[PDB]
Amino acid sequence: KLTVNAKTAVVSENRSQEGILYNDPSRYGKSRKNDEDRDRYIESRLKSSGKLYRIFNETDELQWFLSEIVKKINRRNGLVLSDMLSVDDRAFEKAFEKYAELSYTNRRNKVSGSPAFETCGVDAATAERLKGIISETNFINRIKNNIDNKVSEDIIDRIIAKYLKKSLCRERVKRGLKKLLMNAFDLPYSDPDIDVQRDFIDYVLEDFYHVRAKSQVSRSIKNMNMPVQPEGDGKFAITVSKGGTESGNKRSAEKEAFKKFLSDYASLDERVRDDMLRRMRRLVVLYFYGSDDSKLSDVNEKFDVWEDAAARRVDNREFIKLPLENKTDKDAERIRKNTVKELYRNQNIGCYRQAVKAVEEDNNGRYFDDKMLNMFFIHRIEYGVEKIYANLKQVTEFKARTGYLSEKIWKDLINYISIKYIAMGKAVYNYAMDELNASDKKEIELGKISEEYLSGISSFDYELIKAEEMLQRETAVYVAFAARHLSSQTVELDSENSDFLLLKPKGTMDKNDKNKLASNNILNFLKDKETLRDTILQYFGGHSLWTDFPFDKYLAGGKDDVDFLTDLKDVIYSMRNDSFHYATHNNGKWNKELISAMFEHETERMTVVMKDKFYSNNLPMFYKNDDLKKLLIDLYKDNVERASQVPSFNKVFVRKNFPALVRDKDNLGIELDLDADKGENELKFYNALYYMFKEIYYNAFLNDKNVRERFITKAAENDFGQRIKNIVQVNPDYTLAQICQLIMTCMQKKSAYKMLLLVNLRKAFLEFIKENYAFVLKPYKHDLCDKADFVPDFAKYVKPYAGLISRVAGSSELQKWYIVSRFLSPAQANHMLGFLHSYKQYVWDIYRRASETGTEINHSIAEDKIAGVDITDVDAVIDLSVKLCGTISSEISDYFKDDEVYAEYISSYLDFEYDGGNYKDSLNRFCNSDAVNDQKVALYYDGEHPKLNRNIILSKLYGERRFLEKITDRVSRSDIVEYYKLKKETSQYQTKGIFDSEDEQKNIKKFQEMKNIVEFRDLMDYSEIADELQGQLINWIYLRERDLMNFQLGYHYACLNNDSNKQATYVTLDYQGKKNRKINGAILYQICAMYINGLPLYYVDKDSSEWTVSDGKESTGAKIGEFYRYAKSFENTSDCYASGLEIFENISEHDNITELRNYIEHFRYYSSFDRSFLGIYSEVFDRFFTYDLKYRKNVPTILYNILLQHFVNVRFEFVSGKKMIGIDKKIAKEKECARITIREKNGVYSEQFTYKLKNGTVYVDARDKRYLQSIIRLLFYPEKVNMDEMIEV
């Protein structure tokens, strides 16, 4: 990469912008490059590549013969341009470079012929010598000087397609090279239109001397800009380049013409938009079908553009003639693909030239009056064709159909309009809606650019927006999951009341018959009002932990456990659509005293929980309580805010390698001196040490001052250490985390500097242990104390939560973070915490880079606060949830009425041979039965009662029972038999960690897999994968919802700022009710109110037929209804909300989009299973992202990545399904829909693990066939597939 040293940014000074290069990390005054240094930096990077320049880059008998031919051509005395042109003590280097400059200039100025060296500052005799050096004769001599083989044309064809330098891969250059090589090897060849000197050799010299980049790259950087900038009148519009050259000024004029299109198109009169889309449609028809197409004959034919679009789809015309397939041969298919790409390009050029001529000669009302707008669109069309064939992965007939291309380009043009309105709305929303912020102002104005942005937008500004929008969208996902989890055991929703958060409090009566409760009254959905409080408290660690809590102090009056449920629901709801940017916020309607007291109650258990994790991880089995007490106080006396982009403990200390690592005498030299329970005690020890080291890593090691200094000293390796010294040079106070982040600084996850960081951290940690926790080196196995006896004096020494308690008491916003994170699974809460960390680091990094480049930056987004509250407090709250979500009660009765219902629940996942009687006894019989030899099943029973199984309870609180039952098979006796058999077979080398034999490793892997089954850990895995698939779907929902609002904002902002007719209340609302307010820019205010929880909407009420203002807390659905009643007066439309949305989506499918969004966000899949994950992802791909190609076209890759993260490789096939258009209430029609499926044969395979041994390496499937089967069932259910054929091994 050319600018690998530097970063680029766009800065905006006084409504003029500049693309800058800057060195990072650097100090202010040493970072941003001035014009000369930018120029020289580019020059220097270009001339870097000069002397390694070779025509050709870089086992089968032929494929290795090609490689040998290339190498001989590239070896010395071969075709080495640096040697050839530097001859005679570099005396001609300047002349040759000047020749290259004039050769390039001759192309742009249409000057025919190679330059003569006489005009490069050189006499006539020398010119003859130089011309000979860069002649075909000399090239032929240099090319064959190292070759003593007989090469064929096919060898030449293969070498060119496989090894030719990318900058030389243009048709005429490749043809020139082929002609030269055929002449060099005395093979008859004719290509009369090609001149070897001009088409190949002269071009090579232009490439060698980088004449294009030297004259263009620096200026192209300087002219970079953002998508939208303010104009003179303080209005945002799409950015237009300042041009400066002949072609650049034409390009700017076309862009200005499209800017005018966007203004004119934003018309509430749908006839204006229809006519403009028809003119754009005619341009597409002209481009692909020529000026004599029947739809271009009558210039005033108001043909339906979508009917024409549908017509070209079923058209069979071929855009190009495809060559016949080959006699696979990957070399021959690459040749054919290159031939096909050149065919597309030739036809594209012809189409372009024909269209340009026709819009010049045969317009007369067919196209746009503005010639520059027709040219803008023709350039978009040409570009769109190139996007398709430059991409080309596989030559296919469907992609060669003219109607495929015309309709791809049509949707591409609509895409471009869509993303520009969205880009406008993004600027308006972020920078021209200040007065959305809560105030006492009785008159506000929306759509005026905030003072700090009138001089324009920088790239750093948009980085800050991305940081905030990412966290907002990530948080939105967790709000949905928290609502799901709270709803899952408290209510049974139905299809008409599927959103838990929109259920109404217990006193809500029907509006039309006040004798009845409203249909959405929460009472109608309660699963069991009598156990409601105890059910809720399962999510607060079990009601047994709350026996001392004065609930009745807070549920006084008629308030009961239904109001308790309603208050928690209200906390969660208050975070939905809660904008981080616009505070509406700190006034929660729920019982803040109750929530605050519950938080304080939970903080009181934290020291007990953390010390209990030492106990439960068996640390007091190997170390003295007093030594562990010292450690406990060190680790937990202060809440620790973790920094992002520090390598995880588990990557620095790989669990599989851990026992060998701690025993290594160069590291720690720990050897535990231990009969029967030997291996089990060894395993307990290494598991205990792993947990203790993990806690030390995060809570003591990473922030230790001495660790940092020693890491820097101890720290390719010269490169690594060089950047470290640069980093600390730039700021000596950078923490170790910040050094790691600066060091660590393709859409598809890849199947089968970081190491230096892991190594230096691993060694620094071992030394930290030796220096500070030396008692760790001397473990001694002894008996576990009673749990209550282990450091019972612990809470006396530390009070980490003292300050946070009072801050949560006084913050509605902290209470939201608390309740939302607290209702997540432990893995989800951990992910939420990680997103917070990533947000904080990103914001810090942006300000850091803005600062070093001297870029003024409005601190609307703070480094230390979010939504008004300290990030450190949010962090501590979420961290409290992470820990407590994973702390399961020891009382079965906290989760089930008795051992019998518990045992019956276990039977959903375990076949303990239920006879038909009592479950508790059938399970007790099963655990007391013999499994293998003298091995009894055991596992699932703890003396008198069934064993409390952590994974079972976690699946009950946070997983989806019917889903898990549908995608897995219950654990069986034979599973438990196999578990014990592999236990035995591995019992003698289990903590070796890194093994000698190959079948030792494979058996260890098999045991690990069986342990995961009998422990229900695979269940947790599948639940997390489903949560990740569902979470990504919800993420996409909030991506779309953001961009729908932005589209509407940008479109109506454009409308407000054009001359089209606008009614009074579109521009200005003068609300004279008791909460009176005047709103200038009313349409913009009302758009944003639809999407912001807490922002009132002004409308004419259905029942009173009078103007009112809402409290702003009603649902998005209610707000859309209210918006309709606001707009309802408008005469120039019938649906203002939907104005322009034909660009964003297919209007006829709007209700299906809403239905899909609701299906996902209301978790309906888990109740009905009427469609699969693949089917939902298919419908998202098909029509959820109509508004922006860049989201739509990554939908399958994102799915593939999620699976690959879990070591599952899937091969997609794209086929056809069905979708409805419209929603019956009866006008829904069915049609074809994209269907993403998986190849029926060998479509799913496991990633391989690389296991190192003593010998060498063995490759083992990460995931066995049984695991892969459940993944396929997860993806396909309710559909069933032949998994034997689909799974590869």
Added chain:
RNA sequence: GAAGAUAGCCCAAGAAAGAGGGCAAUAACCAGAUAUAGCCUG
């Protein structure tokens, strides 16, 4: 107004076409350890 994905946009260039650069700006990628043999290898 189906889909056959594995980008998209900005800047530059450009009709005898051009075809370079940039993007934490834009999604993805990378990274992140919550709990006891589950995320190896690089």
